Write a sequence for this structure.
């Protein structure tokens, strides 16, 4: 029992859902390094 | 362990170090195979250079 | 203030020095994205009074 707030046709003033933080800044970001494969000509392509 | 390494390819310098730090504190015996060296015998005097 | 392990063996019998102990019960842990660590801290002294 309890009709949804929509499809009932009257304006009202209800509740929402929130959070506390700035949320988008932590003082960081994903910090990844990439080690290069050594030289060319010896790299394997044939994995199908 | 008796960890043996065939090639140092994707050795992230952090984890490439952590192995050596584990040799000194866990008696880890590690190996390398692609290294070439021409070491030579030295006398008692004149030590190391 | 930090003392040494060589001075702890030569300190005079009746001279009482102070050596501070770290609490650190409430300390915010690091974020999910940050550089790792490699074989760290070794502690050398412990009170047994307590």
């Amino acid at each position: 029992v309890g009709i949804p707030k929509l499809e009932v046709d009257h304006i009202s003033f209800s509740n929402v859902v929130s959070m506390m933080t700035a949320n988008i800044r932590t003082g960081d970001d994903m910090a990844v390094e990439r080690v290069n494969p050594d030289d060319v000509r010896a790299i394997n392509i044939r994995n199908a | 362990v008796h960890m043996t390494i065939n090639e140092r390819a994707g050795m992230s310098k952090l984890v490439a170090d952590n192995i050596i730090a584990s040799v000194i504190k866990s008696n880890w015996v590690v190996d390398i195979h692609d290294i070439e060296y021409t070491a030579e015998v030295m006398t008692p005097s004149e030590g190391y250079t | 203030q930090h003392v040494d392990a060589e001075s702890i063996m030569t300190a005079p019998k009746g001279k009482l020095f102070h050596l501070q102990f770290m609490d650190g019960l409430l300390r915010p842990e690091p974020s999910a994205f940050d550089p790792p660590a490699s074989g760290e801290d070794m502690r050398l002294i412990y009170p047994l009074q307590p």
